[PDB]
Ligand binder design. Structure first.
Ligand SMILES: CC(C)(COP(=O)(O)OP(=O)(O)OC[C@H]1O[C@@H](n2cnc3c(N)ncnc32)[C@H](O)[C@@H]1OP(=O)(O)O)[C@@H](O)C(=O)NCCC(=O)NCCS
Ligand SMILES: CC(C)(COP(=O)(O)OP(=O)(O)OC[C@H]1O[C@@H](n2cnc3c(N)ncnc32)[C@H](O)[C@@H]1OP(=O)(O)O)[C@@H](O)C(=O)NCCC(=O)NCCS
Ligand SMILES: OC[C@H](O)[C@@H](O)CO
Ligand SMILES: OC[C@H](O)[C@@H](O)CO
Ligand SMILES: OC[C@H](O)[C@@H](O)CO
Ligand SMILES: OC[C@H](O)[C@@H](O)CO
Ligand SMILES: [Mg+2]
Ligand SMILES: [Mg+2]
Ligand code: NA
Ligand code: NA
Ligand code: NA
Ligand code: NA
Ligand code: NA
Ligand code: NA
Ligand code: NA
Ligand code: NA
Ligand code: NA
Ligand code: NA
Ligand code: NA
Ligand code: NA
Ligand code: NA
Ligand code: NA
Lengths: 759, 759
């Protein structure tokens, strides 16, 4: 209660409010940002420095893509916020600085999560691990991975081996946490440390009085670790020549300070998704102030945004080949949520919303950061059209429904973590759960719990379904049974994982940038939704005959008659998909969870569509053994054949009400199907999204849309001549990848997906 | 359910029972031991090997005592069960092998408990800590000490600084855990590992069903760590050339296997007390079988016992000078519980009970192991007299009331941890709490919570007592108030400490030798009982006038009139002491504890009588500022002036019912007061103990008695000429020390205590 000079100088001219007396970034934004309803005509192009820097870094990116391996990585240093010396691309040119290690794209060792994974990476990429690192993290500091495997059950291990529940966060950082990095810029580290000491002290009475004793002790230790991490952030920044004890005083510092908060996160944790947040409009407050004061020019502002975004394009983590199969394309999910509307009806689009999108022109297409447009039917048309143009030109953006999510939270300061999972910034996080194989679960119902590939009893022993023709009611009754079992094994695995991750790899630097009490959801994903829905549809509307082996195991199916497939706006099958989503949500909702994290569901797969597909045999819908499932909530490859409106309609029917962790849809449309020329294409794409996301009391609308605007012929050319397309980026599951970063098998999945040929 | 050949061979001839089908050491003992009612005439003397070995080790002991520092210690190795190579005194001579490090008396670094303490020891003893050890245990593996200090409150820190609650286990291993080391001998490691996997598996249903989720996950991880520690025990033993996968097959192996279980404990944990258990009668089963088979001679049996006991005399831990003030004399508390009676009325005294006592003759007096006689009025007179003779000759034994403790537990297989704290072996442990300063708490009541030395507000702000004469009712009402506050701060500190010790230094190798579910008590000790009781007595029966400074602070007292002092069998003051014990027990009983550990109390101080005394000003009883309190439950120095029966009577009145963690009494009697000659002295000492420990429905009896039989003139000679008394041992607080191991200040405390001059 008395702002020192540091705060005074930094906050000069800002509209006053609660944000000056307590940590409240949303209040600061609301009182200070400038809504922008204009067009992209004010945008500046790249400076020579930006191009020199990015062109150099791209040589490392090309090396990564051609070798499908890291440019370099540590073999003898355990990474922490302060372990590495300052690293640069070219110190004379960078306006925003900071790298994870001492060299661009060199990956770190983050051992707290597990030592076996590091050993696996060293073997895979032909480097020798320092014996000391192995010793420390085997005998002295236990890891998250070992804690989990020490407590797992034989049943969970069988599910992992068989492909019914695989790829969970037992061997990589859980992620799904977004510290509010904007807090570093707004308040400075010292203010945040004082606030954390107050939070710590506020728990003393409960501790002394024996109120929720263990929970209170745990939280006090976590806050002490958060406070320690904040101090370490100052030391890290000082290595780069910056004193971040006080608040940022100008645009360059606001961008730099925010990035430093994020840099501490990616130097200390290797979460699968390390998302950036909802920062562009916040940063516009500082940029606008400097532009009006004549302190910086628009080109200088674009340059600072470019250098920040360039650093987000350089975040890297050492991963194993196994991880690469589950999360393809060397992803980071440095997700940035752009635009949206405020609860007061004003748009949250700012000139900076345009500057962030402009990085796809100043430095070309790029998969990271994962730029996510928070769409509203009320967004300024100028912005709707520019975003559509950027999608048409680069296929690098995704869109999510602000008209659905803002009212659901009654909050206009939520951000997207990873692909499609919303959280109020600094107040909420998710316990990541990857996803379960719903399609294989259906086969288990038909086969009495016996795996169709391993011929091992994995699910509970049950009587396999008999007869030469499958009956929908019977199959669905057994499937419901196995969904109960799946939910229990899944939540049990996640309870173990998150208990161990809190114990052995607590994300102190990210949690330090959250309120004292954070809302946690237990995010359960489902893979193979359209395979399961179409399988049920074939059984219900056609005649499906099981082909059994000498043991009675259904290893194939013959289908007589046509049946409705998901993605063609046919309620007969779409209703089955909606039902499966509701059904699984209701089952996980009944189970006890670690830290009482609220169960939620997402229809999302990342590359588990390929991994689970490889481990799943022939299914009733006609899909062949080993074939990929569709990505996320997508109709199976090529089955949506009635056009864009029809497939968008089928997907929009899936209920966000029962899948609050998100519903991913990857939409690819050929240029000429989208429109006759550029202007018409922009108008039509904005129109398609307005219809898909349309929300009213009786219509939920879709929640997410990846948009690719390309001809399949071009991707085939890139498969044959990768050198011609070094920056070619494509949306694939709720994030983007450089097409050349994928393995051939992953490219085959992508090229056989639906390329929509009509409205 | 099918004993392999390993078990068959090892158990040949033993009486069958439950012990062969489940881990049940008590059942094995009950069905196989041979009660011995004879005398000491069968005992053999030392072999040349034993004398050669012990004489060599004693040179290291003399070096420790003269330098008051370790002979040597590690500066670059973090100790674990397998870290050190095999070490020997003289491999050609040892019948029982195993040392903590690679050299006799060389102390280890056990960093999991804290790195600052290690830094403190290195500085104090002039050795340089390896930078790598400091780095690992500051940045990679957090320690118990740092976890505690990260969560402590400013109030607890003020209590620690002021001397009202100091010396708690926030900077050293908590100890008070006795794994059942006999299990290694009886079953072998493989059988115990299979049993632990079954215990782990038995928790799967609760885990899956969400029953006490966090508790279940925690216990499963603990059992996995226990299983891992058992495997490490096999590797440790193999370094010494032994395969302990199967059960011990003869006496030498039973002793060796039991010792290996203990060796793993003292290589991995540095608990203040690392007690041995109740092993002598168990080991007699194997010795008796070999003697009857003619496999070994009695002298060979004594030699194996001697070599085992010699190793217990060599256990060492690196401690700081601060620790040395609180726990003087380089103590280990390798406590062994001898004799006692079974629930069936048979004595549990065996020939081995005599062999253990005989080590005080074969290798001379020694403070460790801490041999504790479980006394019963029904013990064979031959044993009562031999134990009395050993006390008369060596002052190295203590006695505890089996007639009180066995019926309290309805169990005849409990052992004493540290000094006086009983636990059923393998089924119970204590969360150690050190002790609180009850005397200073009384001054706080008189001074409104302000510390009499620091002039700082430590206790809650309260109105200091006014007037020129203190009133008992008023003082007691305020004291009760401050006892409530003390209890809450104490239990809060212990809740933090034990949560952190379970997290950062879980005693896996010891817990591996316990049942799945262990009963835990939260052991709270009180120091200064007789100072507080006598202060209340002076106030109540005499006229006590406070001497106040310019601030109204009572810094001294003048007493007009005589008043009854504790230890003279005067109910007027003894009732006050009994009341204080009951009062504090009732207050801690109301508080919530970590892991729902049952609060218990002990009247025990170790050297906190000196440390708290130094930090406590003048008290109402007349004790001067800085003077030591009495040890444990002892009357203040020299105040028990009516003889042995009178002081034993006062102490026996203290209620074990309200101090289940134990009540320590150190009794020293001059030889001629005890009896005219040797035979009379033995008879009289046994008679005094029979009376003190006498128990019936209406008489509890005393719980513990340290017995010193010496002339003060002899101790004065030892203070002046230590070289003349290298093995001189004396009981001091519930354990023994070599007199030469004490600092001069600690010796001054000891020499000014009461030397009883009459019955
Ligand atoms: C080693 C262990 C995992 C079982 O090993 P297993 O019989 O080979 O198990 P699986 O066949 O299911 O294989 C384990 C899989 O997890 C992988 N893995 C990842 N981290 C691992 C870790 N820390 N330890 C072991 N395996 C690990 C293995 O590489 C393997 O992957 P794969 O199927 O692609 O080859 C054992 O720790 C275990 O059974 N744990 C369960 C809990 C338990 O028993 N605790 C001890 C109780 S006393
Ligand atoms: C460093 C800290 C202990 C306070 O230090 P301080 O102001 O010097 O405290 P005190 O004066 O009471 O001294 C601490 C005593 O504990 C000792 N100590 C033992 N282990 C220690 C450890 N890990 N850290 C600090 N002191 C330690 C110190 O040496 C000192 O002993 P002394 O009184 O004989 O000199 C600080 O960690 C603290 O206040 N912790 C309480 C919890 C807290 O604030 N957590 C962070 C919340 S965001
Ligand atoms: O070696 C036993 C250790 O506790 C290990 O499990 C973690 O470091
Ligand atoms: O280590 C890099 C990964 O192997 C690659 O798949 C990323 O495209
Ligand atoms: O190793 C424990 C430390 O507190 C670490 O978590 C931060 O440096
Ligand atoms: O390190 C040994 C201790 O300093 C000594 O007090 C033991 O007698
Ligand atoms: Mg395996
Ligand atoms: Mg201090
Ligand atoms: Na290039
Ligand atoms: Na770190
Ligand atoms: Na860390
Ligand atoms: Na907790
Ligand atoms: Na729920
Ligand atoms: Na919907
Ligand atoms: Na349209
Ligand atoms: Na000697
Ligand atoms: Na160890
Ligand atoms: Na350990
Ligand atoms: Na627990
Ligand atoms: Na109680
Ligand atoms: Na008593
Ligand atoms: Na007597």
């Amino acid at each position: 209660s008395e702002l020192n000079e540091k705060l005074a100088t930094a906050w000069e001219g800002f509209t006053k409010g609660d944000w000056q007396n307590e940590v409240n970034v949303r209040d600061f934004i609301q009182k200070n940002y400038t809504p922008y309803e204009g067009d992209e005509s004010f945008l500046a192009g790249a400076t020579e420095a930006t191009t020199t820097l990015w062109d150099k870094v791209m040589e490392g990116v090309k090396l990564e893509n051609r070798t499908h391996a890291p440019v370099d990585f540590d073999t003898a240093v355990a990474s922490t916020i302060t372990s590495h010396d300052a690293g640069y691309i070219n110190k004379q040119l960078e306006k925003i600085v900071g790298l994870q290690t001492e060299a661009p794209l060199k990956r770190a060792l983050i051992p707290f999560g597990g030592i076996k994974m590091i050993e696996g990476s060293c073997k895979a990429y032909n480097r020798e691990l320092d014996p000391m690192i192995k010793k420390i993290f085997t005998e002295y500091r236990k890891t998250h991975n070992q804690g989990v495997f020490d407590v797992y059950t034989p049943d969970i291990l069988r599910c992992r081996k068989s492909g019914v529940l695989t790829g969970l966060p037992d061997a990589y950082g859980r992620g799904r946490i977004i510290g509010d990095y904007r807090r570093v810029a707004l308040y400075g580290i010292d203010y945040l440390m004082k606030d954390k000491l107050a939070q710590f002290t506020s728990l003393q009475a409960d501790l002394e009085n024996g109120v929720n004793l263990e929970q209170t002790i745990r939280l006090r230790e976590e806050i002490a670790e958060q406070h320690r991490a904040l101090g370490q952030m100052k030391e890290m920044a000082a290595k780069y020549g910056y004193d971040i004890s006080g608040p940022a005083t100008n645009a360059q510092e606001a961008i730099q300070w925010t990035y430093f908060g994020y840099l501490a996160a990616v130097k200390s944790q290797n979460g699968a998704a390390m998302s950036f947040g909802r920062t562009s409009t916040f940063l516009d407050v500082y940029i606008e102030r400097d532009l009006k004061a004549g302190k910086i020019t628009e080109q200088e502002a674009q340059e600072m945004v470019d250098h920040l975004v360039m650093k987000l394009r350089m975040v890297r983590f050492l991963r194993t080949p196994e991880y690469d199969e589950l999360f393809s394309g060397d992803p980071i999910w440095a997700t940035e949520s752009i635009g949206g509307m405020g609860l007061d009806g004003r748009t949250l689009v700012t000139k900076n919303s345009f500057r962030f999108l402009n990085t796809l022109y100043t430095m070309g297409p790029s998969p990271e950061p994962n730029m996510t447009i928070l769409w509203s039917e009320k967004l300024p048309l100028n912005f709707k059209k520019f975003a559509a143009k950027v999608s048409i030109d680069t296929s690098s953006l995704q869109y999510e429904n602000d008209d659905l999510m803002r009212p659901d939270f009654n909050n206009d300061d939520y951000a997207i973590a990873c692909c499609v999972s919303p959280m109020i910034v600094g107040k909420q996080m998710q316990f990541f759960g990857a996803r379960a194989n719903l399609a294989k679960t259906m086969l288990y119902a038909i086969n009495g719990g016996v795996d169709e590939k391993l011929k091992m009893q994995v699910g509970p022993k049950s009587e396999p379904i008999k007869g030469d023709v499958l009956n929908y009611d019977e199959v669905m009754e057994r499937m419901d049974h196995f969904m109960d079992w799946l939910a229990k094994q899944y939540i049990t695995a996640l309870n173990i994982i998150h208990y161990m991750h809190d114990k052995y790899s607590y994300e102190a630097s990210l949690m330090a940038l959250h309120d004292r009490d954070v809302i946690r959801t237990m995010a359960c994903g489902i893979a193979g939704l359209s395979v399961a829905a179409d399988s049920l549809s074939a059984i219900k509307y056609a005649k499906v005959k099981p082909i059994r082996d000498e043991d009675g195991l259904a290893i194939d199916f013959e289908i007589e008659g046509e049946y409705p497939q998901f993605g063609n706006n046919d309620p007969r099958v779409d209703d089955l998909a909606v039902d499966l989503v509701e059904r699984f949500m209701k089952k996980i909702q009944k189970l006890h969870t670690y830290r009482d994290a609220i169960p939620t569901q997402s229809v999302l797969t990342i590359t588990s569509n390929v991994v689970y597909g490889k481990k799943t045999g022939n299914t009733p819908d006609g899909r062949r053994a080993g074939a990929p499932f569709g990505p996320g909530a997508n109709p199976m490859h090529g089955r949506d054949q009635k056009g864009a409106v029809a497939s968008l309609t089928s997907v929009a029917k899936l209920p966000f009400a029962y899948a609050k962790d998100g519903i991913s849809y990857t939409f690819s449309i050929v240029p000429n199907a989208l429109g006759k020329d550029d202007e018409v294409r922009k108008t039509n794409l904005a129109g398609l999204m307005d219809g898909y996301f349309h929300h009213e009391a009786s219509i939920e609308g879709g929640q997410h849309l990846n948009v690719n605007v390309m001809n399949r012929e071009m991707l085939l050319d890139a498969m044959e001549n990768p050198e011609k397309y070094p920056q070619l980026t494509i949306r694939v599951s709720g994030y983007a990848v450089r097409f050349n970063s994928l393995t051939k098998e992953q490219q085959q999945d992508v090229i056989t997906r639906t390329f929509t040929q009509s409205m």
